[PDB]
Design a protein around this ligand. Structure first.
Ligand SMILES: Nc1ncnc2c1ncn2[C@@H]1O[C@H](COP(=O)(O)OP(=O)(O)O)[C@@H](O)[C@H]1O
Ligand SMILES: Nc1ncnc2c1ncn2[C@@H]1O[C@H](COP(=O)(O)OP(=O)(O)O)[C@@H](O)[C@H]1O
Ligand SMILES: Nc1ncnc2c1ncn2[C@@H]1O[C@H](COP(=O)(O)OP(=O)(O)O)[C@@H](O)[C@H]1O
Ligand SMILES: [Ca+2]
Ligand SMILES: [Ca+2]
Ligand SMILES: [Ca+2]
Lengths: 372, 372, 372
């Protein structure tokens, strides 16, 4: 009778909804706002803290804080506020009679998982729980049982190879370079044109202009020479005060940090070299099927032109005798949640739930034994 | 009315079919695979054991085990699994209404015979059964009655001389030097060029390299001087991860272990000297017929140039006044099956099966007094 | 009258000195460091590259490269620079009038060895050289002529059995599991407690943590049981910035990859099983001396409790009437150089030196015919 809830807790955006549906019921950015100015008006509905889209609407008078930093929950009171808002105010449901599925990045610290188990079996008193890896849900939504998944959120960019439903845990790659670092790099490179962006509302504006006006170059050097010589690549954006800015070559230097991490000073390899070493760390028999199935998910793969540059770099790195095809569906930023709608819908999954009873006589540590 | 099943149960491959047919139907290698990595995707028939060619298909995520090791059935549960697969899936017949002939190497322990008798009669409940020697079935398939048969499968190299149907049990020779050892030696010498192969999955790849690219040199020192002087003997192979390897003298260094077994530390004689010591251990007058009828059989005699080398070595070893002929049919790797199709079809053979009643009155020991 | 040099050029560290001495003079890790930021200060004695301890001290602004990867020399200009540094700058020795001795792990590919000849003769112009197997030098430093040597360096872990000075080439076992893989696995499991290490500069910090605080558990399951049920096993470590970390069960899980290599995903067996198969692949008589003369060498055998654990595992594997002794001297880290100094200063040794003239007619391929 009961229908399970699915809550994709990413790093910047939270997607919560019911199992079996095609699209998430509530998508809103996971932020907590607090007022940085004194209040002169008596009344006004002056809440001590703002959450969700309400904080995003009046961000000019709010200091905004992200409770998730690099896929790791730092502030927990903000997270119980986020989960209370998405349970009671958004979905308008009671958690006492609903199973609940969570998404977590691999190679995460363990105490995050026991505190996640602790802070919702005791407070919201759910009758079931499960925590799953995001890339497994990406293959569930993709409808195939084989491939290597590049998932890049706001904080974590991880590569997971899975062959015939059997994941290889030694081949799991994790990088801390994602869209927040791209936002910070876009803050850094806009100072040459003279536009100053320092505050968190300005960080939201930099995230919006990164969402609307960025793309990946197929080749960096020739398009840099084209932007230096010609005057066709620039575009205009309208700031919400009324000012208009013009951006030339910065709209393709920003995602290039994904392929060249030395721009922000990170020593580690690019995302193409990370994917190629993740394929190279796997066994020799399964690499042929892994070259033919490259699955993407997350909003950071929403830059136009990521697939062609990705295919060119993997085709350069791999030997030429292999065919390389990249699956990039246009609904992939909501991909992982749809896998949750695959996962709770199955009757085979219905006995591996962590109910209240095994949580009582084992403590939080049961989430290590059951989940993953 | 009932058709007898012929199941040549070799070390590497198994060949199952009906008696009277000219070729076996179910030919598949004798491996059992078990999962090695963590299973994450719920459902879709994740089996705990794969046997036969599907284990070859999924070998990148499976640890592989050979139940027969040099003609010794070690793990009997896997052997029962592969007999269940070759009865019920491949041939897809009821084993309780068909007689079953089985093959074995000579100088093999009696508990192997007793346990094959026990598993045939108690588990599958066959109505009749018989066990025969591989070299005798090779001489049946050769279509002659006098000769010395050298059969070298994947795990065993045996040599049996027969004159006018009367075998000579004192002159039967056995040697644990076959295709498994040749594969391991080729795995050892491939590291000199920098190619590394360690796992059991890529042992099949090294076996395929040995099948496709090796050959027997007529003169070893001249071929070594030719490989050292020039590069015409080099050949390339495509691994299934796209990497292209190339090998020079390693094509003919690997089968030379059959003629020079001191390369892997065994102080025993070569297979030509094994035949020469076999032919002098026979009686004084039957040697002339045995020299002209060197029947060759087995899968590891399919190398190019092995017959001319064997001709030169026996012609050097024997006194020069006789003809030495080596019978090498092009279908010789199935010959152990083919005479097994010959032997079960004879009307003079139908009285010497082991029935159910004889097993019930005499225990498993009936196969010692009846079979050979 | 001239003295020989002994330069153990292992995969992690270089240990160089004169023959006849009891201890090496120049011990430094095989590191080539290159700058990765921009240089803004004019002058300051800035160099294009760094080597040795000078690379180690300035590692915060450097990208570090190992030229040797699992025994195989990959980058040759870096290793030429390391040989130039250890000859001219460390030892203060002009190498045109001193012979040198070099070490190499067995089952290495041949193409290193001639190049290990070639730039030794064409660049530095040494009068003679010799290349030796490391386990032979370990048995020289042990002062006995009979035993099996487990040598585990930074890249290669190999077993070599030698009885009465006669090595058995077919029983030599190689396994690519050593201190770099242990460092990478420790770097993987340290993310469970929330400690992140991604750059190659802080890989040396993880190596120092592995050197100081790790130990081999005698029995694994009760050690995990008492690690979960108490906190006496936890130890604290000081990072050089000032931060303090605390490690618990990670102290003994990281040596356990030596005995349970399925943690990092390779299908192969542990070092005790590899030693046991190396003993059983030898001849039937000599095992009486091989069980009682286990010899350990290399820096990877420096963990506390490895000898008692290996004694318990070998005593489990061997039959109970066999006496098993493991020889673990406290100077076994430096034993390869000590045996090289013993061999180089030995009286009958000075006829198997590969001289300049013999290289001049024979080409680089003299090293296969003369050395080993
Ligand atoms: N249309 C778009 N184009 C480029 N980037 C986008 C787009 N939409 C979202 N993003 C980026 O994706 C990141 C978050 O995406 P997503 O993975 O869906 O959320 P989360 O990281 O919270 O799971 C944001 O930092 C944003 O910069
Ligand atoms: N064309 C070939 N070239 C070289 N070796 C071959 C060839 N075909 C088969 N073999 C070898 O024959 C061995 C097994 O052959 P066979 O005797 O038919 O199977 P079994 O030993 O199981 O009875 C294998 O190990 C394989 O290496
Ligand atoms: N005290 C110690 N405890 C544990 N491991 C050590 C210790 N000292 C060195 N090691 C390990 O030994 C490895 C290399 O040691 P060594 O064999 O001396 O150098 P090489 O492998 O270059 O010959 C290093 O990777 C290091 O992790
Ligand atoms: Ca996400
Ligand atoms: Ca055979
Ligand atoms: Ca060493």
């Amino acid at each position: 009778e009961t229908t399970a809830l699915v809550c994709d807790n990413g790093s910047g955006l939270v997607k919560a909804g019911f199992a079996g549906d095609d699209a998430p019921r509530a998508v809103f950015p996971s932020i907590v706002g607090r007022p940085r100015h004194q209040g002169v008006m008596v009344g006004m509905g002056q809440k001590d803290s703002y959450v969700g889209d309400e904080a995003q609407s009046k961000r000019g008078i709010l200091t905004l804080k992200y409770p998730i930093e690099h896929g790791i929950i730092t502030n927990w009171d903000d997270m119980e506020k986020i989960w209370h808002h998405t349970f009671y105010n958004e979905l308008r449901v009671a958690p006492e009679e609903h199973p609940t599925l969570l998404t977590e990045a691999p190679l995460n610290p363990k105490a995050n998982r026991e505190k996640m188990t602790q802070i919702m079996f005791e407070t919201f008193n759910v009758p079931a729980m499960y925590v799953a890896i995001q890339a497994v849900l990406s293959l569930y939504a993709s409808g195939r049982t084989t491939g290597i998944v590049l998932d890049s959120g706001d904080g974590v960019t991880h590569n997971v190879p899975i062959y015939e439903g059997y994941a290889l845990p030694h081949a799991i790659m994790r990088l801390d370079l994602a869209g927040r670092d791209l936002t910070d790099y876009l803050m850094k490179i806009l100072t040459e044109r003279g536009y100053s962006f320092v505050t968190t509302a300005e960080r939201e504006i930099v995230r919006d202009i990164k969402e609307k006006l960025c793309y990946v170059a197929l080749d960096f050097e020739n398009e840099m020479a084209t932007a230096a010589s010609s005057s066709s690549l620039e575009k205009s954006y309208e700031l919400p005060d009324g000012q208009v800015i013009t951006i030339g070559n910065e709209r393709f230097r920003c995602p290039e940090t994904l392929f060249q991490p030395s721009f922000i000073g990170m020593e580690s390899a690019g995302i193409h070299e990370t994917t190629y070493n993740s394929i190279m760390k796997c066994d020799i028999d399964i690499r042929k099927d892994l070259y033919a199935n490259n699955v993407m998910s997350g909003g950071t793969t929403m830059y136009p032109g990521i697939a062609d540059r990705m295919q060119k770099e993997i085709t350069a790195l791999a030997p030429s005798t292999m065919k390389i095809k990249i699956i990039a569906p246009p609904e992939r930023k909501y991909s992982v949640w749809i896998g949750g709608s695959i996962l709770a819908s199955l009757s085979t999954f219905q006995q591996m739930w962590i109910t209240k009873q095994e949580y009582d006589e084992a403590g939080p540590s049961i989430v290590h034994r059951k989940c993953f």
